[PDB]
A = this chain, B = another copy of it.
């Protein structure tokens, strides 16, 4: 018999992104080659099969720094991290290959799906 507030989930995510911009309660640094990205472990787990696996691990859950595979593109990661916190994906001709490869590595199935559909339309 519950009632539901339609905009609640979007409002929560907007405030989680505000916390990220202000660097409040961030508990991990993701290192992608020469670049660093601060984030909330809970948000990363909620969006990515890879981070969900990493942060449920009894040893890795306590790490303050996570280094990604050297093949991962920093811009691709940045675009996906922005997507995690906003639901918006900056998908462009110049970045689609890097975004799709990063999404496959991060196990973000909906992003992989759309990257596949956008590439198929161009061939």
A24 touches B56 (CB 8 A): yes
Interface size on A, as a range, is: 35 or more
Contact of A110 among B5, B13, B87, B89 (CB under 8 A): B5
Which of B3, B61, B90, B111 is close to A1, meaning CB atoms less than 8 Å apart? Answer: B90
Closest to A18 in B: B46
| Beta-carbon contacts under 8 Å, A35-94 to B | 40-43, 45-47, 52, 55-56, 61, 83-84, 87-92
A25 within 8 A of B: yes
Considering the complex, give the chain B residue whose CB is closest to the CB of A79: B2
Interface SS of chain A: helix, strand, loop or mixed? helix
A34 at the interface (CB under 8 A from B): no
CB neighbours of A15 from chain B (8 A): 45-47, 52
Q: Are B12 and A25 in contact (CB under 8 A)?
A: no
A8 at interface by CB-CB < 8 Å: yes
- What are 6 A-B pairs with beta-carbon distances under 8 A? A3-B91, A12-B13, A19-B46, A24-B45, A24-B56, A25-B45
* 10 pairs of A and B residues whose beta carbons are closest in the complex: A15-B46, A8-B87, A9-B9, A2-B88, A9-B13, A9-B10, A12-B46, A3-B89, A4-B88, A2-B90
